[PDB]
Design a protein around this ligand. Structure first.
Ligand code: HEM
Ligand code: HEM
Ligand SMILES: O=C(N[C@H](CS[C@H](Cc1ccccc1)C(=O)NCCCc1cccnc1)Cc1c[nH]c2ccccc12)c1cccnc1
Ligand SMILES: O=C(N[C@H](CS[C@H](Cc1ccccc1)C(=O)NCCCc1cccnc1)Cc1c[nH]c2ccccc12)c1cccnc1
Lengths: 431, 431
């Protein structure tokens, strides 16, 4: 019934099938859908996830309008996500006024100082990361990167926010389809919101963080903060600092392997700023510009978010286009990062895109790997530091080459989340 | 899970059973529940319709705060009602900005002038109402009031808004449980919102009001007005002008019958202002004060709405009480109209409560038969005029006495909506 909203507004888009909308088109993944749609319809198009209208925009001013200018007023919240349960109070899932309070309460966790407090602490598990890697390198056995990176990433997040120290080769107490049917049956979300389909593992263990850091800064600031809400924020932070940190690290190492000129040119800078394999510090990391380039260029090819979303909470007319209340506005971050109308040879890995000679010819509303505006990635600065500190210690000791079973070229997960089809396996040699 | 919100806030209320909340207590009707709860817990209490917290308030300043002071900001919308379908666009069901536009677009329908245009037109079907009554009076047969009143009321609404003239003794083309399960399964509302469970009778007939009045004033003002939205507003107006007008008229005549001193004292005023059985006009109706008293006192005993409701759309602290977002605030209009801490002998029918000698000792936030603030009854003035014009022509010609089968004392419908258990049947004699 509601499948004529874009036929009405004169906005092009793929013809939706009843009930399904255009979800059958996701058979190649969200990214191949947005890339094709970006070609088919232009700067603006609209489709339907079930009965839910999605408006895709690609205009830098419209994107600046949505994510920044009209954030607090109209585009405060993301698509409703359920069933969540108590996790409705998580910052990334909370809406309107409740989200504003959580954003203020958790913002001072990633100040330039609180991050600088974390550099002496992060410098530990990188040496566990090297020593765990020196074992699988002295034996000529190819290495699953996400295993030893995730083992590292998990070690970082548990201490940077709480303080628990665990080598992630022994028992790691941290375990963690149908979401398609959720889009045809979003009416089933409130259904599952009563049968408590939301494990009690950390729901009582992290709840029993009696402690009698991020965990410190929460009870210290407790219209204040709750406790079951404190657990939910811990779950969000623990996931992000693990999966996002590890997945991107595998992405970077795959590119350094298939582009050995970029791997050596980066190794030459690390030994320069840090001679005699010096331990990386807060200020020596921010000095390395080629490392910043390699990180940014990998995030162009693999923005793990793929899409930025905002629910339009009332009728508006942004940049000369009427947008009705309830529409989910979408920024195809993946399709924008590979749009040839902005990037030269956009499928190629070229870190020189982000050189200070060329970093000005890049629109920060086309390149948006961390979002933008008041609801951008809250851990953007931390994640950049945690990854870079990891990249320094690893490349200071090991080089990386492709293996026989290394998937070249890498296929993206044609499924839901931005991951590789096959895991990233590379040979590791010792310098 | 959410059954501790009032246990937390220190707000008293009946202990909710899981899933059901306190809906089993509705076995005597909403009114006997609110009256008892008003006694048990005092100025403020809270219960649960399923999993849905309801906060009942009785404080005149708090009521003034909710319905008027913080209407546009926090208490804009009523409880979500579904499945509705296209009727989501009806003014009484629409929310926030969409409702503001509809309220402005439909407000000038009931100006003092547009109503005055309707007095010469309403004066027709009252004579059909008398002539239909003179037949069942010359025969000594008791009369079902709501039949001949509803036949009258329907005749008024179809012409006052569109223009169609029909004696309501021939075929009337206007026909019109589980809502309890809706409260335990409000998660099922979005479910039914896709299977179009919302007849096409006027959905295409009223949609085919080509006309090529309320209907006039809609296309004339067509960020403007739509057409399927035009149908929905017609359905709302047609129901209200029928059921509310007829039901209250039966209520008034029952009270005049069981209180013949009030019936004669009212008949004496009507013949005074309108001698020689003069036709009532706009200004002769507004002059009759005892008729205004009888109308108001009946609306005290039988406020057909029973309850006023507002969804609290964000955290607030009104009159020194914190109220969390999502709570449905409720004004027990029925229980307030019979509260002995404001009314003397509140079960007795005493029109002298509203005499200009005593109409000042009445708080207009305790007596709220039409709501209050920007979202009060939009047809308040019209309905008062339509009923009073009907009461004049009827009492000018007939007196009313109780019958053998007349339910004395009247039992209210222990069910959902404010109606009598048995229909109102009274003997009609000719003056
Ligand atoms: C390479 C690593 C990461 C990338 C590329 C990334 C990217 C993003 C993006 C694109 C968004 C959405 C922004 C928007 O919609 O405008 C986001 C949100 C968010 N990120 Fe990250 N992120 C990363 C790591 C992290 C880390 C380490 C944390 C640790 C706490 C984190 C916490 C969050 C939270 C809480 C949100 C939701 C913010 C809100 O709704 O207010 N992320 N991230
Ligand atoms: C004796 C007759 C009537 C009584 C006692 C009555 C009472 C009420 C009450 C108590 C409300 C809710 C106000 C609030 O929540 O604050 C309401 C709303 C409403 N009434 Fe009436 N009403 C009557 C007749 C009518 C008539 C004849 C119409 C014709 C159009 C009408 C149209 C409406 C509408 C559209 C609303 C919803 C207003 C909104 O949501 O903005 N009513 N009425
Ligand atoms: O994963 C989606 N997330 C949100 C809705 S809640 C989700 C809840 C969650 C918590 C923990 C683990 C998985 C899921 C969440 O809290 N995730 C951020 C936390 C980690 C993180 C990841 C990346 C960067 N930083 C931090 C929409 C979204 C759209 N675009 C985004 C971009 C970035 C972050 C979130 C979003 C999504 C999954 C499937 C279907 N629909 C939505
Ligand atoms: O009937 C409820 N109505 C609303 C929700 S939508 C309802 C939709 C409707 C339209 C037509 C016929 C029946 C129902 C509506 O449009 N009705 C006003 C129109 C007539 C009218 C009646 C009286 C006075 N004026 C005009 C809540 C409400 C709460 N208190 C009120 C007081 C007055 C009006 C509405 C409300 C209710 C029924 C069962 C369960 N929940 C809600």
């Amino acid at each position: 019934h509601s499948h004529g909203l874009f036929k009405k507004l004169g906005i092009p888009g793929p013809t939706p099938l009843p009930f399904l909308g255009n979800i059958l088109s996701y058979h190649k993944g969200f990214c191949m859908f947005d890339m094709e749609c970006h070609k088919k319809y232009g700067k603006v198009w609209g489709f339907y996830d079930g009965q839910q209208p999605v408006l895709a925009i690609t205009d830098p001013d419209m994107i600046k309008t949505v994510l920044v200018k009209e954030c607090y007023s109209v585009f405060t919240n993301r698509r409703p996500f359920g069933p969540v349960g108590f996790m409705k109070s998580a910052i990334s899932i909370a809406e309107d006024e409740e989200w504003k309070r959580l954003r203020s309460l958790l913002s001072p966790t990633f100040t330039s100082g609180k991050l600088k407090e974390m550099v002496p602490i992060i410098a530990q598990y990188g040496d566990v990361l090297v020593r765990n890697l020196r074992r699988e390198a002295e034996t000529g056995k190819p290495v699953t990167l996400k295993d030893v990176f995730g083992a590292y990433s998990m070690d970082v997040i548990t201490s940077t926010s709480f303080g628990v120290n665990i080598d992630s080769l022994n028992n790691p107490q941290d375990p963690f389809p149908f979401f398609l049917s959720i889009t045809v049956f979003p009416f089933l979300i409130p259904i599952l919101e009563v049968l408590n389909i939301c494990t009690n593992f950390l729901r009582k263990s992290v709840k029993r963080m009696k402690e009698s850091d991020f965990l410190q800064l929460m009870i210290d600031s407790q219209k204040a903060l709750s406790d079951l809400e404190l657990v939910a924020q811990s779950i969000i932070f623990i996931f992000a600092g693990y999966e996002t940190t590890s997945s991107v690290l595998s992405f970077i190492m795959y590119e350094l392997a298939t582009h050995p000129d970029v791997q050596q040119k980066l190794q030459e800078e690390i030994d320069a700023v840090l001679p005699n394999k010096a331990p990386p510090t807060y200020d020596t990391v921010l000095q390395m510009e080629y490392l910043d380039m390699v990180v940014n260029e990998t995030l162009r090819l693999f923005p793990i978010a793929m899409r930025l979303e905002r629910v339009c909470k009332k009728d508006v007319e942004i940049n000369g286009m009427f947008i009705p209340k309830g529409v989910v506005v979408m920024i195809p971050s993946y399709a924008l990062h590979r749009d040839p109308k902005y990037w030269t040879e956009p499928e190629k890995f070229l870190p020189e895109r982000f050189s200070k000679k060329n970093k000005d010819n890049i629109d920060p509303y086309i390149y948006t790997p961390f979002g933008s505006g008041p609801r951008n990635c809250i851990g953007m600065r931390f994640a950049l530091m945690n990854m870079k500190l990891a990249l320094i210690r690893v490349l200071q000791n090991f080089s990386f080459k492709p293996c026989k079973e290394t998937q070249i070229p890498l296929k993206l997960s044609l499924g839901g989340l931005l991951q590789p089809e096959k895991p990233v396996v590379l040979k590791v040699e010792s310098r």
